[PDB]
Design a protein around this nucleic acid. Sequence first.
RNA 1: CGUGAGGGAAAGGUGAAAAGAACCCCGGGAGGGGAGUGAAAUAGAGCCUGAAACCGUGGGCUUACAAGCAGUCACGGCCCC
RNA 2: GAAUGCCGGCAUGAGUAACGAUAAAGAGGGUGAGAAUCCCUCUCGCCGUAAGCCCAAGGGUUCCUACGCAAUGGUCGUCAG
RNA 3: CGAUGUCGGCUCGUCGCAUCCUGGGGCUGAAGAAGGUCCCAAGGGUUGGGCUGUUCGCCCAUUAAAGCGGCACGCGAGCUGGGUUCAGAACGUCGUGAGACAGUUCGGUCUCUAUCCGCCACGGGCGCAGGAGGCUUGAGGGGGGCUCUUCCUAGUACGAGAGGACCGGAAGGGACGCACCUCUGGUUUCCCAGCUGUCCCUCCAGGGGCAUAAGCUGGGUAGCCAUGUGCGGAAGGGAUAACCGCUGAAAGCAUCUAAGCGGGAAGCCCGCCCCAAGAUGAGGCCUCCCACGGCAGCCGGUAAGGACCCGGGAAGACCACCCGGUGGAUGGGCCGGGGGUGUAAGCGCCGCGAGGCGUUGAGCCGACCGGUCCCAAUCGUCCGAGGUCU
Lengths: 204, 59, 131, 16, 118, 122
Amino acid sequence: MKGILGVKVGMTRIFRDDRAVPVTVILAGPCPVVQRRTPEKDGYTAVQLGFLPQNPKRVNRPLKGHFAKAGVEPVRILREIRDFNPEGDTVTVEIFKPGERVDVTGTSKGRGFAGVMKRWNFAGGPDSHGAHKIHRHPGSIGNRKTPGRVYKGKKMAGHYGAERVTVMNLEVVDVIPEENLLLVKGAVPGPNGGLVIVRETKKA
Amino acid sequence: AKHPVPKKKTSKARRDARRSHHALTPPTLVPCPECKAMKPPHTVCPECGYYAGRKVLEV
Amino acid sequence: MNRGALIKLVESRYVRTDLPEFRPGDTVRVSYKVKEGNRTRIQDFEGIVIRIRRNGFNTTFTVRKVSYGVGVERIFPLHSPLIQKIDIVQRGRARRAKLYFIRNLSDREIRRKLRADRKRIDQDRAAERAA
Amino acid sequence: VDKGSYLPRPTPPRPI
Amino acid sequence: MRHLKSGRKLNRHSSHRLALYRNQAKSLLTHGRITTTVPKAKELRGFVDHLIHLAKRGDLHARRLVLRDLQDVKLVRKLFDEIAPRYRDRQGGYTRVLKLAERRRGDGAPLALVELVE
Amino acid sequence: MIQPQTYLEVADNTGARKIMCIRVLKGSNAKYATVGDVIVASVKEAIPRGAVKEGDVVKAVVVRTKKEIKRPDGSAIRFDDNAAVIINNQLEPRGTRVFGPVARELREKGFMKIVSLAPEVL
RNA sequence: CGUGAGGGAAAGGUGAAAAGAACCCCGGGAGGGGAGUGAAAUAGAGCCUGAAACCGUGGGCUUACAAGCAGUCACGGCCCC
RNA sequence: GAAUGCCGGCAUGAGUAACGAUAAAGAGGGUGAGAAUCCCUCUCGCCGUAAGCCCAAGGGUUCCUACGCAAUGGUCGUCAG
RNA sequence: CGAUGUCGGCUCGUCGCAUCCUGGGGCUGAAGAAGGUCCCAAGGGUUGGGCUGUUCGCCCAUUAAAGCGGCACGCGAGCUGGGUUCAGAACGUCGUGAGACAGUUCGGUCUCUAUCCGCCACGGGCGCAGGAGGCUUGAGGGGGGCUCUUCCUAGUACGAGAGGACCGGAAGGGACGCACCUCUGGUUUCCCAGCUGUCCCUCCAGGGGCAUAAGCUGGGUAGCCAUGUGCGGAAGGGAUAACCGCUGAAAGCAUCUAAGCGGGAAGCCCGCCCCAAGAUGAGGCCUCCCACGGCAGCCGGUAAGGACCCGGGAAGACCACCCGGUGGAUGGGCCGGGGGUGUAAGCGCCGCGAGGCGUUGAGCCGACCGGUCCCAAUCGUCCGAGGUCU
Ligand SMILES: [Mg+2]
Ligand SMILES: [Mg+2]
Ligand SMILES: [Mg+2]
Ligand SMILES: [Mg+2]
Ligand SMILES: [Mg+2]
Ligand SMILES: [Mg+2]
Ligand SMILES: [Mg+2]
Ligand SMILES: [Mg+2]
Ligand SMILES: [Mg+2]
Ligand SMILES: [Mg+2]
Ligand SMILES: [Mg+2]
Ligand SMILES: [Mg+2]
Ligand SMILES: [Mg+2]
Ligand SMILES: [Mg+2]
Ligand SMILES: [Mg+2]
Ligand SMILES: [Mg+2]
Ligand SMILES: [Mg+2]
Ligand SMILES: [Mg+2]
Ligand SMILES: [Mg+2]
Ligand SMILES: [Mg+2]
Ligand SMILES: [Mg+2]
Ligand SMILES: [Mg+2]
Ligand SMILES: [Mg+2]
Ligand SMILES: [Mg+2]
Ligand SMILES: [Mg+2]
Ligand SMILES: [Mg+2]
Ligand SMILES: [Mg+2]
Ligand SMILES: [Mg+2]
Ligand SMILES: [Mg+2]
Ligand SMILES: [Mg+2]
Ligand SMILES: [Mg+2]
Ligand SMILES: [Mg+2]
Ligand SMILES: [Mg+2]
Ligand SMILES: [Mg+2]
Ligand SMILES: [Mg+2]
Ligand SMILES: [Mg+2]
Ligand SMILES: [Mg+2]
Ligand SMILES: [Mg+2]
Ligand SMILES: [Mg+2]
Ligand SMILES: [Mg+2]
Ligand SMILES: [Mg+2]
Ligand SMILES: [Mg+2]
Ligand SMILES: [Mg+2]
Ligand SMILES: [Mg+2]
Ligand SMILES: [Mg+2]
Ligand SMILES: [Mg+2]
Ligand SMILES: [Mg+2]
Ligand SMILES: [Mg+2]
Ligand SMILES: [Mg+2]
Ligand SMILES: [Mg+2]
Ligand SMILES: [Mg+2]
Ligand SMILES: [Mg+2]
Ligand SMILES: [Mg+2]
Ligand SMILES: [Mg+2]
Ligand SMILES: [Mg+2]
Ligand SMILES: [Mg+2]
Ligand SMILES: [Mg+2]
Ligand SMILES: [Mg+2]
Ligand SMILES: [Mg+2]
Ligand SMILES: [Mg+2]
Ligand SMILES: [Mg+2]
Ligand SMILES: [Mg+2]
Ligand SMILES: [Mg+2]
Ligand SMILES: [Mg+2]
Ligand SMILES: [Mg+2]
Ligand SMILES: [Mg+2]
Ligand SMILES: [Mg+2]
Ligand SMILES: [Mg+2]
Ligand SMILES: [Mg+2]
Ligand SMILES: [Mg+2]
Ligand SMILES: [Mg+2]
Ligand SMILES: [Mg+2]
Ligand SMILES: [Mg+2]
Ligand SMILES: [Mg+2]
Ligand SMILES: [Mg+2]
Ligand SMILES: [Mg+2]
Ligand SMILES: [Mg+2]
Ligand SMILES: [Mg+2]
Ligand SMILES: [Mg+2]
Ligand SMILES: [Mg+2]
Ligand SMILES: [Mg+2]
Ligand SMILES: [Mg+2]
Ligand SMILES: [Mg+2]
Ligand SMILES: [Mg+2]
Ligand SMILES: [Mg+2]
Ligand SMILES: [Mg+2]
Ligand SMILES: [Mg+2]
Ligand SMILES: [Mg+2]
Ligand SMILES: [Mg+2]
Ligand SMILES: [Mg+2]
Ligand SMILES: [Mg+2]
Ligand SMILES: [Mg+2]
Ligand SMILES: [Mg+2]
Ligand SMILES: [Mg+2]
Ligand SMILES: [Mg+2]
Ligand SMILES: [Mg+2]
Ligand SMILES: [Mg+2]
Ligand SMILES: [Mg+2]
Ligand SMILES: [Mg+2]
Ligand SMILES: [Mg+2]
Ligand SMILES: [Mg+2]
Ligand SMILES: [Mg+2]
Ligand SMILES: [Mg+2]
Ligand SMILES: [Mg+2]
Ligand SMILES: [Mg+2]
Ligand SMILES: [Mg+2]
Ligand SMILES: [Mg+2]
Ligand SMILES: [Mg+2]
Ligand SMILES: [Mg+2]
Ligand SMILES: [Mg+2]
Ligand SMILES: [Mg+2]
Ligand SMILES: [Mg+2]
Ligand SMILES: [Mg+2]
Ligand SMILES: [Mg+2]
Ligand SMILES: [Mg+2]
Ligand SMILES: [Mg+2]
Ligand SMILES: [Mg+2]
Ligand SMILES: [Mg+2]
Ligand SMILES: [Mg+2]
Ligand SMILES: [Mg+2]
Ligand SMILES: [Mg+2]
Ligand SMILES: [Mg+2]
Ligand SMILES: [Mg+2]
Ligand SMILES: [Mg+2]
Ligand SMILES: [Mg+2]
Ligand SMILES: [Mg+2]
Ligand SMILES: [Mg+2]
Ligand SMILES: [Mg+2]
Ligand SMILES: [Mg+2]
Ligand SMILES: [Mg+2]
Ligand SMILES: [Mg+2]
Ligand SMILES: [Mg+2]
Ligand SMILES: [Mg+2]
Ligand SMILES: [Mg+2]
Ligand SMILES: [Mg+2]
Ligand SMILES: [Mg+2]
Ligand SMILES: [Mg+2]
Ligand SMILES: [Mg+2]
Ligand SMILES: [Mg+2]
Ligand SMILES: [Mg+2]
Ligand SMILES: [Mg+2]
Ligand SMILES: [Mg+2]
Ligand SMILES: [Mg+2]
Ligand SMILES: [Mg+2]
Ligand SMILES: [Mg+2]
Ligand SMILES: [Mg+2]
Ligand SMILES: [Mg+2]
Ligand SMILES: [Mg+2]
Ligand SMILES: [Mg+2]
Ligand SMILES: [Mg+2]
Ligand SMILES: [Mg+2]
Ligand SMILES: [Mg+2]
Ligand SMILES: [Mg+2]
Ligand SMILES: [Mg+2]
Ligand SMILES: [Mg+2]
Ligand SMILES: [Mg+2]
Ligand SMILES: [Mg+2]
Ligand SMILES: [Mg+2]
Ligand SMILES: [Mg+2]
Ligand SMILES: [Mg+2]
Ligand SMILES: [Mg+2]
Ligand SMILES: [Mg+2]
Ligand SMILES: [Mg+2]
Ligand SMILES: [Mg+2]
Ligand SMILES: [Mg+2]
Ligand SMILES: [Mg+2]
Ligand SMILES: [Mg+2]
Ligand SMILES: [Mg+2]
Ligand SMILES: [Mg+2]
Ligand SMILES: [Mg+2]
Ligand SMILES: [Mg+2]
Ligand SMILES: [Mg+2]
Ligand SMILES: [Mg+2]
Ligand SMILES: [Mg+2]
Ligand SMILES: [Mg+2]
Ligand SMILES: [Mg+2]
Ligand SMILES: [Mg+2]
Ligand SMILES: [Mg+2]
Ligand SMILES: [Mg+2]
Ligand SMILES: [Mg+2]
Ligand SMILES: [Mg+2]
Ligand SMILES: [Mg+2]
Ligand SMILES: [Mg+2]
Ligand SMILES: [Mg+2]
Ligand SMILES: [Mg+2]
Ligand SMILES: [Mg+2]
Ligand SMILES: [Mg+2]
Ligand SMILES: [Mg+2]
Ligand SMILES: [Mg+2]
Ligand SMILES: [Mg+2]
Ligand SMILES: [Mg+2]
Ligand SMILES: [Mg+2]
Ligand SMILES: [Mg+2]
Ligand SMILES: [Mg+2]
Ligand SMILES: [Mg+2]
Ligand SMILES: [Mg+2]
Ligand SMILES: [Mg+2]
Ligand SMILES: [Mg+2]
Ligand SMILES: [Mg+2]
Ligand SMILES: [Mg+2]
Ligand SMILES: [Mg+2]
Ligand SMILES: [Mg+2]
Ligand SMILES: [Mg+2]
Ligand SMILES: [Mg+2]
Ligand SMILES: [Mg+2]
Ligand SMILES: [Mg+2]
Ligand SMILES: [Mg+2]
Ligand SMILES: [Mg+2]
Ligand SMILES: [Mg+2]
Ligand SMILES: [Mg+2]
Ligand SMILES: [Mg+2]
Ligand SMILES: [Mg+2]
Ligand SMILES: [Mg+2]
Ligand SMILES: [Mg+2]
Ligand SMILES: [Mg+2]
Ligand SMILES: [Mg+2]
Ligand SMILES: [Mg+2]
Ligand SMILES: [Mg+2]
Ligand SMILES: [Mg+2]
Ligand SMILES: [Mg+2]
Ligand SMILES: [Mg+2]
Ligand SMILES: [Mg+2]
Ligand SMILES: [Mg+2]
Ligand SMILES: [Mg+2]
Ligand SMILES: [Mg+2]
Ligand SMILES: [Mg+2]
Ligand SMILES: [Mg+2]
Ligand SMILES: [Mg+2]
Ligand SMILES: [Mg+2]
Ligand SMILES: [Mg+2]
Ligand SMILES: [Mg+2]
Ligand SMILES: [Mg+2]
Ligand SMILES: [Mg+2]
Ligand SMILES: [Mg+2]
Ligand SMILES: [Mg+2]
Ligand SMILES: [Mg+2]
Ligand SMILES: [Mg+2]
Ligand SMILES: [Mg+2]
Ligand SMILES: [Mg+2]
Ligand SMILES: [Mg+2]
Ligand SMILES: [Mg+2]
Ligand SMILES: [Mg+2]
Ligand SMILES: [Mg+2]
Ligand SMILES: [Mg+2]
Ligand SMILES: [Mg+2]
Ligand SMILES: [Mg+2]
Ligand SMILES: [Mg+2]
Ligand SMILES: [Mg+2]
Ligand SMILES: [Mg+2]
Ligand SMILES: [Mg+2]
Ligand SMILES: [Mg+2]
Ligand SMILES: [Mg+2]
Ligand SMILES: [Mg+2]
Ligand SMILES: [Mg+2]
Ligand SMILES: [Mg+2]
Ligand SMILES: [Mg+2]
Ligand SMILES: [Mg+2]
Ligand SMILES: [Mg+2]
Ligand SMILES: [Mg+2]
Ligand SMILES: [Mg+2]
Ligand SMILES: [Mg+2]
Ligand SMILES: [Mg+2]
Ligand SMILES: [Mg+2]
Ligand SMILES: [Mg+2]
Ligand SMILES: [Mg+2]
Ligand SMILES: [Mg+2]
Ligand SMILES: [Mg+2]
Ligand SMILES: [Mg+2]
Ligand SMILES: [Mg+2]
Ligand SMILES: [Mg+2]
Ligand SMILES: [Mg+2]
Ligand SMILES: [Mg+2]
Ligand SMILES: [Mg+2]
Ligand SMILES: [Mg+2]
Ligand SMILES: [Mg+2]
Ligand SMILES: [Mg+2]
Ligand SMILES: [Mg+2]
Ligand SMILES: [Mg+2]
Ligand SMILES: [Mg+2]
Ligand SMILES: [Mg+2]
Ligand SMILES: [Mg+2]
Ligand SMILES: [Mg+2]
Ligand SMILES: [Mg+2]
Ligand SMILES: [Mg+2]
Ligand SMILES: [Mg+2]
Ligand SMILES: [Mg+2]
Ligand SMILES: [Mg+2]
Ligand SMILES: [Mg+2]
Ligand SMILES: [Mg+2]
Ligand SMILES: [Mg+2]
Ligand SMILES: [Mg+2]
Ligand SMILES: [Mg+2]
Ligand SMILES: [Mg+2]
Ligand SMILES: [Zn+2]
C-alpha cells in the first residue's frame, strides 16, 4: 500500500486520443516521513507523513520536539498511510505513474443543516392539490402503537457534508513531477485548497 | 396541527437543570495603556479617548 | 502556491494559438476531424456563431446552421485538437453577445439584424497584405 | 376497504 | 448556504440597501466621520473608497460616475476639490473603522466610527 | 431526451407526420430516450393512404433531439426538433426516404440504412 | 357587564399617643443607610398577628457506569448533639 | 383531598410564542440623570378618488400652554389622545 | 362512548417468507433451447400509463420480474379529503303524512407554538490520578449488496428440421448510490446593457427614484446545482443451505455417517466505504513542562500549554471546527489577470431629423486566480503541573 498527502487545486479537461477527459489537479508532493509506526513499537505498520512548510513562529514546543527527532523542518499537516513503508525519507508524486488507479480521500463540501430533500433525496410533498405547508417535509416517521417509536438511523434532516469522503479507483491521467502535480480523472471530494489523501486503489 | 401541550408539570429540579447553562459570562476587559482604566479590548477607550497610541475621540 | 497558475500550467500544453479571431454574428466554417469507422475524415460545418463562452483554455463557441430544413447548432471547444482550421466567411455585426434570438427569426429577418460588419471586413482585407 | 365510520368528521372548538 | 459570497444583506431589500450605503456615503463625505453599527461600517468602507478613487481620476466621466450615488454637485465639488487631493499618493484605504466601547441602550447594538483618513 | 407523452416529428415517408412516444424501449424503466434509442409510439397525425395511419402503435428510432447530446471529443450537437424514423422489428426503416440531418451516433448503433438514406449526417 | 329589562363585585385593623421619622449620606426618582420617636419599628404607613403553596441567599450531607410510584428494611461513610 | 366543586393566591409550559400589515430607513446637531424611539436639519422611502381636505353621526375636553414620567403606550421615552 | 379520527391516495419506511425476479439445487413424460414441479435462499430488486374515490380488478406498453402478507386493514399533533356521518337540493322507491332507503345525484369549516420518551443533528459539563500538543489501534456499530442486452467460444455440443447451449471470455446499458462543476445545462435581487411612463437633478447632454418584496426586457461570473461528469455494487479468502460425493462399519452385501474427509448459493463471516476508547474494559505511540512558596487536602504564583478578545472562513442556526492577529496577506481597499456586458462619456465628422460613423472591444464591472501593509486584526488579560496508595 502506498499513499501521499496533497491539496486539491482545481478541475479541467485535457485531450488524449481525440477525447476530452475531465481531470482534477492535485498538488501532492513533497511529503517527508516524520515517523514510522512499527509492530514492536506501535502494533501496526504505517508512515506518518508531514506536508506543507510552516512558520516555526507558530509551531509549539511539543510539536517542535516531534519534528526535531525526525530531523524535519516544521510542517503544517501530519497524516498517516497504513501499510506503507517507503525506502526513502521523502515521498513524492513519482510513486504514481499514469494509468495507475487511485483512491482519493477528502473532506466533502458542507451544506450545514440540510433538509431531508437535499440530504436524502426525499420526494417531499406536492406543490398544489391542497398540499399544506409540507412541500419539503419528510412525511411519516413511523407506525403507530406498535412499535410506538422511531428506528435508530431514521433518515432525517440534519447536518450534511464536511465529512470524510473517499471516491475510489480513479485513473491517474498524468503526473508532472517537477511541479509536484497529479492529474486524476474525474471528481475529488471537497473544495479547492482542500487537503486530500491519494492512495493506491484497492479495486482490481 | 393538534395543539401539543405539556403532559406533566416540570419539576423544580427539571426546570432548574435546564438553566444550568444560563449563567452570564462576565465582560472581557483589559487595562487601557494610557489611563489604566478597564475597558473591552479592541475598542477605543471611552475614558481618555485613546486607541493604538493616539488620541482618537473626545471623551 | 498559486492554484490558478498551476491549472493554466496544466492547460498550457493543449492551448491553440493558430485560430482566427471571430465574434458572435460572424459567419464561420469550422473544419472538424470526424471519425466514422474505421477511417477519419474532415467534415465541414458552416454557420453563424451565436455564442462564445469564455474561460481561458475552456472557452467554447456555438455555431448555428440550417441543414436540410432543420436547424442545427454545434458546440465546439475553442482549443479542440479535432479542429483543423476555421475560415471566416463573413463578418456580422451584433449588438449583443449571445444571439439565441435568431432561432425565432426568418432567414430574411436574420439578414437584416446581422448586417455585414463593414469595419472588421475592411480590417480583414487590410491585413492579408503580406510581405 | 370501505367499512363503517365510527366518528363524525371533526372540527376544532374554542376554550375560553 | 453562503459559500464564497461577498456582501451583507443587512435585512434590507435590493434598493433600500443601495440607498442605505449611498446615504451613509453622503454623510461620511460630509462630516468626515460618522457613528454607526459595526456591520454597516465595515461594509461602508468599500462603497466610499471607490468614490474617493474616482475623484482621484478627476475627469468628467468619473464625476458623472460619482454623481450617480452622491447626487449632490456641491458635495462632489467638495469631493474633487478638497477631499480627493488628500489621497493623491495613497494606495486605497482612504477610510478606517474603529469600534466604540459601549452599546446602544435601547437594543444593545455594537457601535463603531467610520472616518476618512488623514 | 424523449419520454412518454413526447411528440416527435417523423423524418421519413412512411406517411406519419407526428408520433407520441408511449414507451422508451431500453431496460426495465428508462426515463429518457436519446438519439439511437428505439421507442414505442402512437401515430397521432398522418397523411392519407400512407404505410401508417393515425392510431397505429409503431416502433421508431430517434434521429434528432432538441436537447443537445454530448460527444467524447468534448463537443455537442443540438437540433431544432425531436424527430424519429419508423422501423420494423428488425430495426430497418419502413419507408424508403429520410428527410433532414441525422445524428452520427446512429451509425455506431447499427442504423446504417438510415445513415445512408439521410441527406446529411452531423 | 348588558341596546334594554336586568346582572352585579372586590375592598375592614399602624400605635396607648402621630410621637407618621428633623437633619445628613447614595440615588433623577423610587428605594435604602445612619440620626430620631416608641415598651416594641421584620408596629414605618405596600403598617396587628403574618400559616401554606411559591421564589431566593447561606451552610451540612450527597450526586456525572446509572433503571424509577421515589419509599421501606439493613449495614457502612460523613456532619451535628 | 378529590365533586371538569367555589373564592383567592402562587406555580408549570419559558426567558419560550409573540411585540398587530415587508411603505424603509441613514446621519448630524440639540435636550436630559438616562435617548434607535423626544425636538431640529440634511438625505432616503410610502400615500396622493388618499394614507390629503371639508361636512354629518357618534365620542365628550380628547383641543391649546406650563409642569411631570408611577402607571397607561405591546420596547424605550426626556415624548403622548 | 369525561372520544382509541374512521376508506383510498401521498410521503416515509420496516419486518415476515407460504419466493415474483436474480443465485444454488433434486425429479422431469429433462435431446438442445425453453417449460413443469418440489427443495435451499429474504442480499438486492420488483416500471410507466388508460378507467374508477376506490382498495381490488380489467386494459395498454414494457420488464429479469412486474410477489403476497404484517406493522391500530403501518403512517390525518406528517399532508390530502376523492369516498364515508350532520345541516341544502333533486331523482327512482316506500310512506296518507312528517319523513325514509348496504339506492343514486350536485354541494358541503381537517386546530400557527412539542413538556416527557423516541428519532436526526450540534454543544456544555465531568471523567479517563501529573499536566499538556499531536498522531493513531479498532472493540462495537452503520453504509453497500440489483440486473439486462449484445459479441466471442460456436451456427460448435444436441436436433430430421426448426431451433440452439453448458464452461470460459469481452463489450455496452437500465435503475439506484456517493462525490464533483472541467464540459453540457440551470439559477445568478443589481455584474453589464437596452426600453416605457412619470417625477426630479440642471435648460440641453448626462443621470437618480419609482413602477415588486429586481418597473420591464436581453445576457451573466463565482457559488449552490442536474438534465451534466467521475466513481461504486465487486474481486478475493472462510464457514454453510438444499444438494452431490470420498472412504466406511453397525448389517460378510449395501449405505454421504455411526469414526473421519471433500464439493456446494445473489445468501452467512471477513474483505470495501463511513462512525467509533463515555470500549468508565475510558487503549496505544511521539513529543513538551516538571523536582514552586504558605499551613491523595487547602490558598497562591507560574511552566508546557489553553482560553478570552479581534480579522476571517466552500466551517456554520447559536455553539463547535478551521485559518490568521503587525515576526502579518486574515478580511476591506488598491493594482494585475480572469470573467460578464458588448464599443461609456466627451468630442469630431455626416444627415433637415429620428439617427449613423470614428475615437473604441470601448466604458463599466459581485464573489474567481493573485500581488500590494494603504485600512483594520491596537494594547492585553485570565486560567493553567508539583504528580494518591499497595
Ligand atoms: Mg503491511
Ligand atoms: Mg484528513
Ligand atoms: Mg431540502
Ligand atoms: Mg437543504
Ligand atoms: Mg432550503
Ligand atoms: Mg436543496
Ligand atoms: Mg444527497
Ligand atoms: Mg434530486
Ligand atoms: Mg421526487
Ligand atoms: Mg412524488
Ligand atoms: Mg417535487
Ligand atoms: Mg386545507
Ligand atoms: Mg403552500
Ligand atoms: Mg417507518
Ligand atoms: Mg415498544
Ligand atoms: Mg445515527
Ligand atoms: Mg460538521
Ligand atoms: Mg472500469
Ligand atoms: Mg394548518
Ligand atoms: Mg410532574
Ligand atoms: Mg407539580
Ligand atoms: Mg412542564
Ligand atoms: Mg420538563
Ligand atoms: Mg418538584
Ligand atoms: Mg431550587
Ligand atoms: Mg436560581
Ligand atoms: Mg428540563
Ligand atoms: Mg492607546
Ligand atoms: Mg480556476
Ligand atoms: Mg486562452
Ligand atoms: Mg490561457
Ligand atoms: Mg422579404
Ligand atoms: Mg473601416
Ligand atoms: Mg362496518
Ligand atoms: Mg438560501
Ligand atoms: Mg468569499
Ligand atoms: Mg456574506
Ligand atoms: Mg450589494
Ligand atoms: Mg439595520
Ligand atoms: Mg433579510
Ligand atoms: Mg433589522
Ligand atoms: Mg429579516
Ligand atoms: Mg430595516
Ligand atoms: Mg424597487
Ligand atoms: Mg459636527
Ligand atoms: Mg471592486
Ligand atoms: Mg464596538
Ligand atoms: Mg458596552
Ligand atoms: Mg429598550
Ligand atoms: Mg465590541
Ligand atoms: Mg422531417
Ligand atoms: Mg383517428
Ligand atoms: Mg397498431
Ligand atoms: Mg362597555
Ligand atoms: Mg356597551
Ligand atoms: Mg351602560
Ligand atoms: Mg389588613
Ligand atoms: Mg387608629
Ligand atoms: Mg391602636
Ligand atoms: Mg441627587
Ligand atoms: Mg447627590
Ligand atoms: Mg441629593
Ligand atoms: Mg427626568
Ligand atoms: Mg426617600
Ligand atoms: Mg430612611
Ligand atoms: Mg424608647
Ligand atoms: Mg429610644
Ligand atoms: Mg414590657
Ligand atoms: Mg429599633
Ligand atoms: Mg430600619
Ligand atoms: Mg408588631
Ligand atoms: Mg390591638
Ligand atoms: Mg406584618
Ligand atoms: Mg409580610
Ligand atoms: Mg412563608
Ligand atoms: Mg424554599
Ligand atoms: Mg450556597
Ligand atoms: Mg443550596
Ligand atoms: Mg459497562
Ligand atoms: Mg459512580
Ligand atoms: Mg441511579
Ligand atoms: Mg438508585
Ligand atoms: Mg420500580
Ligand atoms: Mg443484612
Ligand atoms: Mg386541595
Ligand atoms: Mg374522599
Ligand atoms: Mg383541564
Ligand atoms: Mg385531564
Ligand atoms: Mg362541582
Ligand atoms: Mg379543592
Ligand atoms: Mg385557581
Ligand atoms: Mg433563547
Ligand atoms: Mg418550547
Ligand atoms: Mg423557537
Ligand atoms: Mg399573537
Ligand atoms: Mg421570535
Ligand atoms: Mg404593531
Ligand atoms: Mg401578532
Ligand atoms: Mg399582538
Ligand atoms: Mg409584523
Ligand atoms: Mg411590524
Ligand atoms: Mg419588518
Ligand atoms: Mg415599493
Ligand atoms: Mg425592518
Ligand atoms: Mg446627540
Ligand atoms: Mg449636557
Ligand atoms: Mg429615545
Ligand atoms: Mg432614554
Ligand atoms: Mg439620533
Ligand atoms: Mg422609532
Ligand atoms: Mg391624482
Ligand atoms: Mg388610483
Ligand atoms: Mg356633535
Ligand atoms: Mg369613549
Ligand atoms: Mg384626560
Ligand atoms: Mg404663553
Ligand atoms: Mg410612564
Ligand atoms: Mg417609564
Ligand atoms: Mg421610569
Ligand atoms: Mg408622580
Ligand atoms: Mg413602557
Ligand atoms: Mg398594544
Ligand atoms: Mg427630563
Ligand atoms: Mg413637552
Ligand atoms: Mg395617550
Ligand atoms: Mg394634541
Ligand atoms: Mg368509544
Ligand atoms: Mg378529559
Ligand atoms: Mg381522557
Ligand atoms: Mg378528549
Ligand atoms: Mg389517541
Ligand atoms: Mg399514485
Ligand atoms: Mg405527500
Ligand atoms: Mg407521487
Ligand atoms: Mg417494521
Ligand atoms: Mg410493506
Ligand atoms: Mg426479525
Ligand atoms: Mg407453496
Ligand atoms: Mg405475478
Ligand atoms: Mg436459478
Ligand atoms: Mg430461483
Ligand atoms: Mg430453479
Ligand atoms: Mg420435452
Ligand atoms: Mg424437447
Ligand atoms: Mg435446458
Ligand atoms: Mg428446476
Ligand atoms: Mg406453485
Ligand atoms: Mg423456504
Ligand atoms: Mg430476497
Ligand atoms: Mg420485503
Ligand atoms: Mg400505475
Ligand atoms: Mg390512475
Ligand atoms: Mg385503481
Ligand atoms: Mg394500504
Ligand atoms: Mg384479488
Ligand atoms: Mg372493482
Ligand atoms: Mg370485468
Ligand atoms: Mg423479458
Ligand atoms: Mg426467463
Ligand atoms: Mg402495474
Ligand atoms: Mg399476482
Ligand atoms: Mg406488498
Ligand atoms: Mg396490514
Ligand atoms: Mg385503528
Ligand atoms: Mg383489520
Ligand atoms: Mg389505515
Ligand atoms: Mg383482524
Ligand atoms: Mg396495503
Ligand atoms: Mg400496507
Ligand atoms: Mg392513525
Ligand atoms: Mg398519527
Ligand atoms: Mg387532518
Ligand atoms: Mg386519511
Ligand atoms: Mg397521536
Ligand atoms: Mg362526487
Ligand atoms: Mg340538488
Ligand atoms: Mg304509498
Ligand atoms: Mg305516493
Ligand atoms: Mg300503502
Ligand atoms: Mg325511518
Ligand atoms: Mg343515503
Ligand atoms: Mg352506505
Ligand atoms: Mg348497491
Ligand atoms: Mg343509478
Ligand atoms: Mg357509489
Ligand atoms: Mg354523489
Ligand atoms: Mg354528496
Ligand atoms: Mg362549489
Ligand atoms: Mg365531499
Ligand atoms: Mg375546505
Ligand atoms: Mg389537517
Ligand atoms: Mg394556522
Ligand atoms: Mg416554540
Ligand atoms: Mg422537548
Ligand atoms: Mg415519557
Ligand atoms: Mg417512554
Ligand atoms: Mg429526547
Ligand atoms: Mg425531544
Ligand atoms: Mg443521535
Ligand atoms: Mg462531548
Ligand atoms: Mg454527546
Ligand atoms: Mg484506569
Ligand atoms: Mg488530545
Ligand atoms: Mg490491529
Ligand atoms: Mg468490527
Ligand atoms: Mg456500545
Ligand atoms: Mg456461431
Ligand atoms: Mg442457422
Ligand atoms: Mg444450422
Ligand atoms: Mg460466424
Ligand atoms: Mg451442426
Ligand atoms: Mg444433422
Ligand atoms: Mg449433425
Ligand atoms: Mg436461423
Ligand atoms: Mg459469461
Ligand atoms: Mg456495467
Ligand atoms: Mg437502497
Ligand atoms: Mg460550481
Ligand atoms: Mg465554473
Ligand atoms: Mg455552469
Ligand atoms: Mg452554462
Ligand atoms: Mg441562461
Ligand atoms: Mg449596479
Ligand atoms: Mg424613457
Ligand atoms: Mg426615468
Ligand atoms: Mg420642483
Ligand atoms: Mg435629457
Ligand atoms: Mg442618460
Ligand atoms: Mg440604480
Ligand atoms: Mg420619488
Ligand atoms: Mg425602479
Ligand atoms: Mg409614490
Ligand atoms: Mg431600476
Ligand atoms: Mg451561465
Ligand atoms: Mg450560459
Ligand atoms: Mg454563475
Ligand atoms: Mg443525472
Ligand atoms: Mg464467497
Ligand atoms: Mg470457500
Ligand atoms: Mg468450502
Ligand atoms: Mg453412489
Ligand atoms: Mg464405497
Ligand atoms: Mg465396502
Ligand atoms: Mg466391506
Ligand atoms: Mg460424522
Ligand atoms: Mg451420533
Ligand atoms: Mg464439507
Ligand atoms: Mg466433488
Ligand atoms: Mg452480484
Ligand atoms: Mg477519533
Ligand atoms: Mg477515524
Ligand atoms: Mg481515552
Ligand atoms: Mg480515536
Ligand atoms: Mg473522552
Ligand atoms: Mg460493557
Ligand atoms: Mg492497545
Ligand atoms: Mg487515551
Ligand atoms: Mg495499540
Ligand atoms: Mg506522533
Ligand atoms: Mg528545583
Ligand atoms: Mg520549576
Ligand atoms: Mg511546608
Ligand atoms: Mg493554584
Ligand atoms: Mg502564554
Ligand atoms: Mg473567531
Ligand atoms: Mg463567523
Ligand atoms: Mg460552510
Ligand atoms: Mg464564539
Ligand atoms: Mg489561534
Ligand atoms: Mg495580540
Ligand atoms: Mg505585536
Ligand atoms: Mg514581514
Ligand atoms: Mg488580502
Ligand atoms: Mg486583497
Ligand atoms: Mg467580510
Ligand atoms: Mg481585481
Ligand atoms: Mg480586471
Ligand atoms: Mg473579456
Ligand atoms: Mg460607436
Ligand atoms: Mg462615445
Ligand atoms: Mg456634418
Ligand atoms: Mg446636413
Ligand atoms: Mg448638422
Ligand atoms: Mg481600430
Ligand atoms: Mg477600462
Ligand atoms: Mg478594460
Ligand atoms: Mg463567489
Ligand atoms: Mg486565472
Ligand atoms: Mg483575491
Ligand atoms: Mg497597517
Ligand atoms: Mg510584503
Ligand atoms: Mg493559578
Ligand atoms: Mg508493600
Ligand atoms: Zn484610556
